[PDB]
Ligand binder design. Structure first.
Ligand code: CLA
Ligand code: CLA
Ligand code: CLA
Ligand code: CLA
Ligand code: CLA
Ligand code: CLA
Ligand code: CLA
Ligand SMILES: CC1=C(/C=C/C(C)=C/C=C/C(C)=C/C=C/C=C(C)/C=C/C=C(C)/C=C/C2=C(C)CCCC2(C)C)C(C)(C)CCC1
Ligand SMILES: CC1=C(/C=C/C(C)=C/C=C\C(C)=C\C=C\C=C(C)/C=C/C=C(C)/C=C/C2=C(C)CCCC2(C)C)C(C)(C)CCC1
Ligand SMILES: CCCCCCCCCCCCO[C@H]1O[C@H](CO)[C@@H](O[C@H]2O[C@H](CO)[C@@H](O)[C@H](O)[C@H]2O)[C@H](O)[C@H]1O
Ligand SMILES: CCCCCCCCCCCCO[C@H]1O[C@H](CO)[C@@H](O[C@H]2O[C@H](CO)[C@@H](O)[C@H](O)[C@H]2O)[C@H](O)[C@H]1O
Ligand SMILES: CC1=C(C/C=C(\C)CCC[C@H](C)CCC[C@@H](C)CCCC(C)C)C(=O)c2ccccc2C1=O
Lengths: 730, 84, 156, 176
């Protein structure tokens, strides 16, 4: 193939009918293949038997993405500069209600665009630059318009390095399949030399240029643009030219100092970010590690070492492969990358890291739910791709007899447990709520489960939270309050419209959501675990790995023989996770507003967006539409004719798209065939169809168009439901 | 220069122990874990002899006593010869 | 043909020892004037105190760059042109005597080196004629920022 | 390893290019002879004397009729005979292809030797300036933007601004 091989055509092939699997697209026409090929455009069974390139392709695809983010966000940073909102907001923050983005007025459009601002019509934003942003001190719109093109610079170039691979004559095996350094480098000087470098441009420049912003001015009444070198008088305030120390060390005297740092603990008052000053120290104290750390090392060495009696021989040469699986060294990653994103989602809302967040409610919960769906959308993946390992990747058997070969040894076992785990949960983890209804609708509270009724009695108080703030008995020194303000001990005092941050004390009715999470996190994983484990051969099929991780279903026999596979375990596992996350979101905002998100008022009488309705009334799972869905959402179905309106006006579509999924999810296949011909007939009479044999959806494509829609349906529904109950009161 | 020059002599002190210490601590490696303390090959006591770090913690102390009086509590003496 | 830049293992530093000669006599004007410098208003102001006793009376006009691009042309022409085979110098459109070459394709003191006979006197490998002029180059490099300022020469 | 352009409408692209550039010819000499304004000076009255104007747009329709016919009829025959259907010589229709367009009809034909040609003799005159004119025009048309933009006055429009020091024009010269 042979248009024409090797040596002797530069001449490209566009044309003669084109390619895949060897009874290649037929010649003779079909539809499905147009759906094939976007799908499974890369799988890597095909293109070559021999890994050869592909690692030589996946470096390039990676380059494309890095550019693209860059194309992105130049865009963003643009938008952010020259449709400003920002200059205006910053003198002005805690008045402003901020936009980057504006429509043009054509047809309806422009209901949308409603006064945001330092006096301009806007669409209000809830990702915050304007808060990443506070940091730049120097300011002004045309720069961000430099940071912007600085973006388009990185891109074109960090996108001609992708020419400067695959397409260019390009690289070979050793380079990846000798690993020996790679984390050495990465973590040492970038992980390090960023955070390090970030330190250097995180007190140099930023600290001072918001050290005396947290007062007001009209900027540049404060900051010259370069201003900040050989110079510096200004460091003098924010501290000394080290005055006489030497390269740290000690024969140093302070009668009154210790270098910038000086740790913060708690939140700024009048910018309650948390101190802009533990922010240098912490990043500095990072990098070092990485700076020292990325200095291992070259490998099996450590992995081949420790063994135990249960413990695994396999552990050793736990994978010559690992260097060349790929699909496995992506699956591992996603679990981490993914599980290391939604750990953001907490440390964020219970410890803001940007100036003006919390007061800014809606511009950091959007966040805590966007970052939340990735620390989930990337985890089910982190299973799929292991399934993609577990079936195929190595030519041959020679992994042999380990730790894995071990885990599999039991397998109707690791998943034998985990199962009961879930029905123990569920019964202790949902029908728990249903008690309440059945008995509060029967009505006898004496015996509910209410935080008042079934006795723990009125304290949450001591577990960890109370040991955590309360923190300095300790080898701990530091800082007037907490690591996180929310923890029980301490403080009234945070912020200027509004409440930002307060204990959150829980009790029960934090107790049992916290448990539904368990059962939801667990039966999610059951299906993926048992899915990826039983990947290749099963008690129902042995001849099971033979085409596929995909195949539709083996065949009507054995009783059912349908779902099986593991595309589909990574099809019914998404289906859950959509809840896993979809109900964790439902948790946070009902809390964070029922308690916390606030207002301060004279003598500080806190006024929670809802006076804690949560109390006795989440425990009832109707209260979850009495107090939630039917209570809030009244802002979604009132939202017409306004400015945000695009939410209420989405909330019907996408609350439609979902209720279109079921058609794709719930239906046969030779059905829409049987139909597609009646069609095809009427077509031929007028002479208008045959060519490119119109065909119904590819059993599993149909499932691909379930799910995917069920999610972008059922999801943006709340993306709307949300942005519509924090914009406007809250 | 300054106490800071005494400090130049002193970068030499931290830099020093650590590095001068360094080779011994690596020099027969592939020990991994462990020692004279544990399995096969006793001789008893503790010992007296051999270096890397027995001798330099001592040095931060040396620097200390001489340095010591000079700044201090205006600093002995005590003489005795005075000196005679 | 759609374009060629043959590289073998060290293409670079064939130049490099080259970027270095040019670069090197630019250590240069250091070797043997020295500050644009910056962003040009003075009109009032030097880095941060620069100057004092803005740079310079300063003629200069940035037209360079318009110069950098323009001489760029020469650089890349000498290099193709000699790809070569030479018409090149037309000489006198008519007629007769054209003694004069002037000698050479140059390199060095006689277009053909020339005047071969010489000294009784003055009487008593060519990456070295490179190596030492980075050891003249990277040197002003730090000498731009060559200060400790708050203090000064500890040495001294 | 390099694109393949060659592109194949193409040879046409080059004759399109002649139109653009020879036409580009009218501009330069005449405007610029410009009257080297001028001895002095230039008045229109005359037709347009007071007739409620002359052209506006109507001038454009006449301009086009006169042309439509020409640009139109045209390429329609720079050449092209045979003119139908099924299978390829490739020009892209190619119909003229084998048959010139006619065996025996007429003198479609011009000149000696069963051919179109004026014949061998001359690239000469007109490949170098007329194509050199491909070049010329482009830079001198590139010169036109240079010559107006910056609109001295009237209109900034939408400023992030940040000029003046001084105006732009053509009379000629350059200052500096
Ligand atoms: C405004 C600016 C000023 C500045 C900052 C520069 C800067 C520069 N010019 Mg330049 N130039 C200027 C004014 C300036 N020029 C003016 C007013 C003229 C008109 C004459 C030129 C004409 C000019 C030419 C023709 C070239 C430059 C080149 C250069 C670059 C060469 C780098 C170098 O060190 O070569 C010199 C350093 C060396 C180590 C080379 C040594 C060769 C010497 C011995 C020959 C000249 C000395 C000679 C013996 C003196 C005899 C007198 C003779 C001039 C009549 C450099 C960036 C060159 C370039 O960069 O092209 C790609 C070259 O193109 N300039
Ligand atoms: C870091 C990892 C990342 C990478 C590099 C890959 C790479 C790969 N995955 Mg994969 N995957 C990932 C994360 C990743 N995945 C995650 C997180 C999941 C869990 C959801 C999966 C679940 C998954 C499955 C089930 C499969 C793969 C497969 C593959 C392979 C096929 C790629 C392809 O053809 O594109 C596929 C992309 C398309 C066909 C584009 C369609 C996208 C639609 C669904 C739009 C999404 C909705 C969005 C809102 C629409 C845009 C807006 C619109 C309304 C305007 C490839 C090697 C496939 C394989 O067979 O292995 C060889 C197999 O299908 N992946
Ligand atoms: C991150 C994403 C991406 C996205 C989703 C958008 C989206 C948008 N951009 Mg945009 N833009 C981007 C990157 C992006 N841009 C980049 C990288 C740049 C730098 C080249 C720009 C430079 C840019 C300009 C100059 C404009 C837009 C405008 C717009 C809006 C006009 C819609 C349109 O483009 O078609 C129609 C729309 C909201 C327009 C606008 O803001 O007016 C309403 C304005 O025209 N963009
Ligand atoms: C990797 C980091 C980053 C970078 C690129 C710089 C770069 C610089 N710093 Mg610096 N700095 C940083 C992080 C960084 N810093 C951090 C985290 C701190 C505090 C922990 C400082 C505290 C600091 C001080 C007190 C000073 C500098 C100065 C400087 C300048 C010259 C001296 C020097 O540090 O290196 C070059 C090395 C030598 C000149 C020797 C140079 C622009 C000085 C300056 O203004 O210019 C001389 C001096 O004021 N820095
Ligand atoms: C199957 C193997 C072999 C056996 C029989 C054991 C047995 C044991 N291990 Mg163990 N271990 C092994 C291999 C083995 N290990 C290997 C290979 C490793 C390295 C991977 C370890 C790392 C390890 C750790 C860190 C610990 C143990 C502990 C223990 C003990 C549990 C405490 C207990 O019951 O007393 C408690 C009874 C009371 C009445 C009180 C138990 C005796 C635990 C221990 O040290 O004892 C508590 C400790 O947790 N093991
Ligand atoms: C794109 C633009 C933005 C703008 C408008 C500027 C503008 C300027 N920069 Mg600059 N700069 C920028 C981004 C920008 N920079 C960025 C992103 C960086 C690092 C990313 C720098 C790093 C930088 C340095 C190191 C210097 C300047 C200097 C200058 C000034 C020379 C001006 C002069 O007086 O000539 C008439 C000028 C004000 C120079 C300066 O300020 O000293 C004179 C100095 O050399 N800039
Ligand atoms: C496709 C292109 C490539 C190729 C293959 C050529 C080929 C040629 N060019 Mg040319 N050229 C090119 C790109 C190219 N050029 C470009 C990008 C430019 C910039 C616009 C020029 C500008 C240019 C000029 C000004 C001249 C040529 C000339 C020539 C011809 C001989 C050179 C000469 O007479 O001057 C050397 C001068 C002599 C007096 C030589 C006399 C006889 C011997 C020396 C010829 C060897 C030759 C056919 C020359 C020509 O006659 O074209 C009309 C003319 O000099 N070229
Ligand atoms: C040789 C040399 C050198 C070097 C230099 C350089 C070149 C450097 C650097 C620096 C660096 C190299 C830095 C880096 C940094 C990095 C960073 C800082 C990272 C980042 C990133 C980001 C920011 C991202 C984010 C995110 C996330 C979170 C995930 C996803 C999403 C997003 C993307 C947003 C030095 C200096 C010594 C000097 C001398 C010479
Ligand atoms: C008549 C007609 C028509 C029709 C129309 C209609 C009727 C429509 C509709 C529609 C509907 C009724 C619905 C839809 C919806 C859609 C959507 C919806 C899309 C998209 C999306 C997006 C862009 C998203 C994003 C996101 C993210 C980022 C992730 C998650 C979240 C969210 C979702 C937010 C047309 C004109 C067309 C054509 C012609 C004919
Ligand atoms: C919501 C249900 C109540 C259950 C928890 C109640 C226990 C703690 C008491 C009230 C908690 C609110 O804490 C709040 O106390 C006071 C309200 O009376 C306010 O008191 C604040 O106002 C005044 C201004 O100088 C002074 O009395 C205080 O020095 C100052 O802290 C504060 O804004 C806040 O620190
Ligand atoms: C080198 C000088 C440039 C050439 C021009 C000078 C005149 C020489 C004749 C060429 C002029 C072109 O026009 C002329 O070409 C022919 C020369 O073969 C003429 O004369 C010839 O025509 C036929 C070829 O075309 C021959 O078979 C005939 O025997 C003869 O009549 C034609 O009647 C006329 O069409
Ligand atoms: C409804 C449904 C169908 C029928 C769905 C079909 C046929 C969707 C395919 C329709 C395509 C996308 C229309 C494409 C036509 C246009 C793209 C062509 C014109 C181009 C434009 C300019 C409009 C299935 O095939 C199916 C298969 C398996 C399980 C469930 C189901 C299922 O539920």
């Amino acid at each position: 193939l042979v248009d024409r091989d090797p040596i002797k055509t530069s001449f490209e092939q566009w044309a003669k009918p084109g390619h895949f699997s060897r009874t290649i697209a037929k010649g003779p026409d079909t539809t499905t293949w147009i759906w094939n090929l976007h799908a499974d455009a890369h799988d890597f069974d095909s293109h070559t038997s021999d890994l050869e390139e592909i690692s030589r392709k996946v470096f390039s695809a990676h380059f494309g993405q890095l550019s693209i983010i860059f194309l992105w966000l130049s865009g963003m940073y643009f938008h952010g500069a020259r449709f400003s909102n920002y200059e205006a907001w910053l003198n002005d923050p805690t008045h402003i209600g901020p936009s980057a983005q504006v429509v043009w007025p054509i047809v309806g459009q422009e209901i949308l665009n409603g006064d945001v601002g330092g006096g301009f019509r806007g669409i209000q934003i809830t990702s915050g630059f304007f808060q990443i942003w506070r940091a730049s001190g120097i300011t002004s719109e045309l720069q961000l318009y430099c940071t912007a093109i600085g973006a388009l610079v990185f891109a074109g170039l960090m996108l001609f390095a992708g020419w400067f691979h695959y397409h260019k004559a390009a690289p070979k095996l050793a380079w990846f399949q000798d690993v020996e350094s790679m984390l050495n480098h990465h973590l040492a000087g970038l992980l390090g030399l960023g955070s390090l470098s970030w330190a250097r441009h995180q007190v140099h420049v930023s600290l001072p240029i918001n050290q005396f912003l947290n007062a007001g001015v009209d900027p540049k009444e404060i900051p010259l643009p370069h201003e900040f070198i050989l110079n510096r008088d200004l460091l003098a305030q924010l501290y000394p030219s080290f005055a006489e120390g030497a390269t740290p060390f000690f024969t140093l005297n302070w009668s009154k100092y210790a270098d910038f740092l000086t740790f913060r603990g708690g939140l700024d008052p009048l910018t309650g970010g948390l101190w802009l000053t533990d922010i240098a120290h912490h990043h500095l104290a990072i990098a070092i590690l990485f700076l020292i750390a990325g200095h291992m090392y070259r490998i099996k060495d450590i992995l081949e070492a420790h063994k135990g009696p249960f413990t695994g021989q396999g552990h050793k040469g736990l994978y010559e492969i690992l260097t060349t699986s790929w699909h496995a060294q992506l699956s591992i990653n996603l679990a981490m990358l993914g599980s290391l994103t939604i750990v953001v989602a907490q440390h964020m809302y219970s410890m803001p890291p940007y100036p003006y967040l919390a007061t800014d409610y809606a511009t950091q919960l959007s966040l805590f739910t966007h970052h939340m769906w990735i620390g989930g959308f990337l985890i089910v993946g982190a299973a799929a791709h292991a399934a993609i390992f577990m079936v195929r990747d190595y030519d041959p058997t020679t992994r042999y007899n380990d730790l894995l070969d071990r885990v599999l040894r039991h397998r109707d076992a690791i998943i034998s447990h985990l199962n009961w785990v879930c029905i123990f949960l569920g019964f202790h983890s949902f029908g728990l709520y249903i008690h309440n209804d059945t008995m509060s609708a029967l009505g006898r509270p004496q015996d509910m489960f209410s935080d008042t009724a079934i006795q723990l009695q009125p304290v949450f108080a001591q577990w960890i939270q109370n040991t955590h703030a309360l923190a300095p008995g300790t080898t701990a020194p530091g800082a007037t309050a907490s690591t996180s303000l929310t923890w029980g001990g301490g403080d009234l005092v945070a912020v200027g419209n509004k409440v930002a941050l307060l204990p959150i004390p829980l009790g029960t009715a934090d107790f049992l959501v916290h448990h539904i999470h368990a059962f939801t996190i667990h039966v999610t994983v059951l299906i993926l675990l048992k899915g990826v484990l039983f990947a290749r051969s099963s008690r129902l099929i042995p001849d099971k790995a033979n085409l596929g991780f995909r195949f539709p279903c083996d065949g009507p026999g054995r009783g059912g023989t349908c779902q099986v596979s593991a595309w589909d375990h990574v099809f019914l596992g998404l289906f859950w996770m959509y809840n896993s996350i979809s109900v964790v979101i439902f948790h946070f905002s009902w809390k964070m507003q029922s308690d916390v998100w606030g207002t301060i008022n004279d003598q500080g009488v806190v006024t929670h967006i809802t006076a804690g309705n949560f109390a006795q009334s989440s425990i009832t799972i109707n209260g979850w539409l009495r107090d939630f869905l039917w209570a809030q959402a009244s802002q979604v179905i009132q939202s017409y004719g306004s400015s945000l309106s695009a939410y209420g006006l989405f909330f019907l579509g996408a609350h439609f798209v979902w209720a279109f999924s079921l058609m794709f999810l719930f239906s046969g296949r030779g059905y829409w065939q049987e139909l597609i011909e009646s069609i095809v007939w009427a077509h031929n009479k007028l002479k208008v169809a045959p060519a490119t044999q119109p065909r119904a959806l590819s059993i599993v494509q149909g499932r691909a168009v379930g799910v995917t829609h069920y999610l972008l349906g059922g999801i943006a529904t709340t993306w709307a439901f949300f942005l519509a109950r924090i914009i406007a009161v809250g | 220069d300054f106490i800071g020059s005494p400090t130049n002599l002193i970068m030499v002190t931290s830099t020093s122990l650590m590095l001068f210490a360094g080779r011994f601590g690596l020099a027969p490696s592939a020990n991994r874990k462990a020692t004279a303390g544990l399995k096969l090959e006793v001789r008893d006591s503790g010992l007296q002899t051999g270096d890397p770090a027995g001798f330099t913690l001592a040095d931060t102390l040396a620097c200390g006593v001489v340095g010591h009086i000079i700044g201090v509590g205006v600093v002995l003496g005590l003489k005795n010869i005075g000196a005679l | 043909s759609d374009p060629e830049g043959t590289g073998g293992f060290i293409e670079p530093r064939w130049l490099a020892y080259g970027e270095v000669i040019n670069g090197r006599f630019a250590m240069l004007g250091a070797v043997g004037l020295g500050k644009v410098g910056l962003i040009p208003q003075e009109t009032a102001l030097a880095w941060f105190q620069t100057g004092v006793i803005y740079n310079y009376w300063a003629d200069n006009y940035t037209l360079f760059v318009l110069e950098m691009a323009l001489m760029g042309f020469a650089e890349h022409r000498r290099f193709q042109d000699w790809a070569k085979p030479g018409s090149m110098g037309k000489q006198y459109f008519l007629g007769l005597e054209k003694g004069f070459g002037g000698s050479g394709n140059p390199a060095y003191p006689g277009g053909p080196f020339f005047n071969p006979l010489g000294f009784g006197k003055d009487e008593k490998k060519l990456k070295e004629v490179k190596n030492g002029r980075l050891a003249m180059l990277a040197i002003l490099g730090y000498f731009i920022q060559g200060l400790v300022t708050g203090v000064g020469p500890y040495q001294n | 390893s390099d694109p393949e352009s060659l592109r194949w409408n193409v040879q046409a692209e080059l004759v399109h290019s002649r139109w653009a550039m020879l036409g580009a010819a009218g501009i330069f000499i005449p405007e610029f002879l410009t009257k080297l304004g001028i001895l002095n000076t230039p008045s229109w009255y005359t037709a347009g004397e007071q007739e409620y104007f002359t052209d506006t747009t109507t001038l454009f329709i006449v301009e086009l009729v006169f042309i439509g016919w020409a640009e139109g009829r045209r390429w329609a025959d720079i050449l092209n005979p045979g003119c139908v259907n099924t299978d390829p010589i490739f020009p892209n229709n190619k119909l003229t292809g084998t048959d010139v367009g006619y065996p025996g009809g007429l003198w479609f034909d011009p000149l000696g030797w069963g051919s179109a040609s004026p014949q061998k003799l001359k690239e000469l005159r007109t490949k170098e300036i007329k194509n050199g004119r491909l070049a010329m025009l482009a830079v001198m048309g590139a010169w036109f933007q240079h010559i107006y933009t910056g609109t001295g006055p009237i209109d900034n429009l939408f400023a992030h601004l940040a000029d003046p020091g001084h105006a732009t024009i053509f009379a000629a010269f350059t200052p500096k």
